Write a protein that binds this ligand. Structure first.
Ligand SMILES: Nc1nc2c(ncn2[C@@H]2O[C@H](COP(=O)(O)OP(=O)(O)O)[C@@H](O)[C@H]2O)c(=O)[nH]1
Ligand SMILES: Nc1nc2c(ncn2[C@@H]2O[C@H](COP(=O)(O)OP(=O)(O)O)[C@@H](O)[C@H]2O)c(=O)[nH]1
Lengths: 165, 164
């Protein structure tokens, strides 16, 4: 079970819309998905299991600093079948990677939607996102399918064992 | 003002994506918005306040049958500024109104996003959503802006007394 795995105050899971973040959240089975509107046009989905807070919002296109406080892990979910917006995904990851309040957080990239036939594999996304130029920060890419749960654990197993080194 | 209204079962708030339904749910302030995924591709936002259940999903499955059994009012949210998709919203409301398990549920229409300059007012939304063709059912349209809550009270007050 996934509750025993995380046996990190905030895990920020972001990415473009329709990447599957809400589905991954529901697949964790760690509590209800609560959605709040802190400010207008800013939707946030949260799952508080005990002490761990999974914060989710879509990116694309300064109150985020508050969430970046005590964010020990970043999960960047990607639609591996969305070749039209993979460049936009890299630029959004590069944006948050260059946030000084977030450089301490470990990064987990999810090459989601591997079930689709023309989806890019985990290593093509590795290159498209430019992950191999990351330095002074542990990162890990995991091939996942959120609607099934494939790879969701082994990815988050790396995350939980990475924050608690 | 909102929480006072529904103090005295199932309310179905449907509409196209980006219509403002999540925004309205947060304005009710009757409880936390809970997102659930009963089946793949079906996202449902729910706000429960003791007796009442505010169910929200996007339109545009035979599973809807079982949400309908005690659905007393349906709130159809439509973005008054989205002129390209207004006909699609008309089709999805017609599919909802032809449903037999919701035949006795009153209809509240919310012409949302009136704050935008090129947004269709409640008059032509009424004309193009086809509310005057509606018989066998009391319906009501209200011009709203869920961002500021403009109009939500007057529309939910009508819903309050029809199902009060
Ligand atoms: N084929 C496939 N579809 C997925 C997967 N994960 C999510 N989806 C679909 O992507 C759509 C959007 O999912 P959602 O979790 O709401 O994306 P979000 O915007 O990041 O929250 C849904 O209709 C899901 O069915 C996956 O692993 N494979
Ligand atoms: N201008 C304006 N924007 C709105 C209004 N209501 C919602 N929005 C915007 O529409 C976007 C999506 O709204 P949402 O409630 O999530 O739509 P939903 O798909 O029905 O849940 C949000 O980013 C809001 O900023 C409104 O009355 N006026």
């Amino acid at each position: 079970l996934f509750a025993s795995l995380l046996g990190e105050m905030r895990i920020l899971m972001v990415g473009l819309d329709a990447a599957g973040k809400t589905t991954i959240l529901y697949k964790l089975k760690l509590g209800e998905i609560v959605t709040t509107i802190p400010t207008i046009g800013f939707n946030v989905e949260t799952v508080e299991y005990k002490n761990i807070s999974f914060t989710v919002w879509d990116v694309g296109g300064p109150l985020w600093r508050y969430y970046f406080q005590n964010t020990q892990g970043i999960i960047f979910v990607v639609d591996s079948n969305d070749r039209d917006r993979i460049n936009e995904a890299r630029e959004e990851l590069q944006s948050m990677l260059n946030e000084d309040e977030l450089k301490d957080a470990v990064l987990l990239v999810l090459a989601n939607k591997q079930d689709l036939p023309n989806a890019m594999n985990a290593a093509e996304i590795t290159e498209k996102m430019g992950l191999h130029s990351i330095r002074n920060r542990p990162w890990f890419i995991q091939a996942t399918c959120a609607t099934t749960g494939d790879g969701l654990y082994e990815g988050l197993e790396w995350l939980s064992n990475q924050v608690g080194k």
